[PDB]
Amino acid sequence: TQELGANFENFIGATEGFSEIAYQFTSHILTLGYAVMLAGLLYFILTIKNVDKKFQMSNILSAVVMVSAFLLLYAQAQNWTSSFTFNEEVGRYFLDPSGDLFNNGYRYLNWLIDVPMLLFQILFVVSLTTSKFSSVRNQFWFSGAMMIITGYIGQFYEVSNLTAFLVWGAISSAFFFHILWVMKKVINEGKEGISPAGQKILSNIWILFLISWTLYPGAYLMPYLTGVDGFLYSEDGVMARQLVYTIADVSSKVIYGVLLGNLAITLSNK
Ligand code: NA
Secondary structure, eight states, rough: OOSSOOHHHHHHHHTTOHHHHHHHHHHHHHHHHHHHHHHHHHHHHTEEEEGGGHHHHHHHHHHHHHHHHHHHHHHHHHHHHHHHEEEETEEEEEEEETSOOTTTTTHHHHHHHHHHHHHHHHTTTTTOOOOOHHHHHHHHHHHHHHHHHHHHHHTTTTOOHHHHHHHHHHHHHHHHHHHHHHHHHHHHHHHHSOHHHHHHHHHHHHHHHHHHHHHHHHHHGGGGOOOSSTTTTTTHHHHHHHHHHHHHHHHIIHHHHHHHHHHHHHHHOO
């Protein structure tokens, strides 16, 4: 019975190990991830003056999100390289008992912190019509927290009890769907009575939001999307999962923030 290998990354690292390519690709994509957040941080700080005061809480939230994402993705990246070490005899990277083992906590903490801020920030750019700010905020914050909490619980069972992993994942997905429903309503209200240039940006924000947020459950399920004997149930699934999480992080935090800032500017023209 495998004792060293809590999550799929540790499981693969303790059994099959990672090829040089899988190890280096994953390290590099994780590094690109935190590097983009640092660049984003400087961007959101420097451009804060480009929007009217009434919208600046959004730019502020983007900056705070970047701080958390840079730190925690930096920590994630160091955790990757510290956790797996090369064996000369076999020629692959294996889980290093003298390391601390791969830990998903960094990313899940980042989500817990950032999800509520990302959801909140749009409410400082668009105006609602018939909904209340407090009601939308509360719905986003409760569902967002429950989504990440239930997903975190699920992740614990990814190796030891795939049933529990999938059931907690489905519970999390229920909260996710409710978030999508609320955000779609917010975007539709925000489009009312603004310029068509702003409306177009909001349409793009919705598509970005829908796609980028759905990448997360996709990455969560990735190693199983081809079966337990499938091609992804391997280092390939680890590489794909980490790639997709990184694409999702950049899109959902940085690109989303840039679009919101551009919306604010278009509202800053009429
Ligand atoms: Na290493």
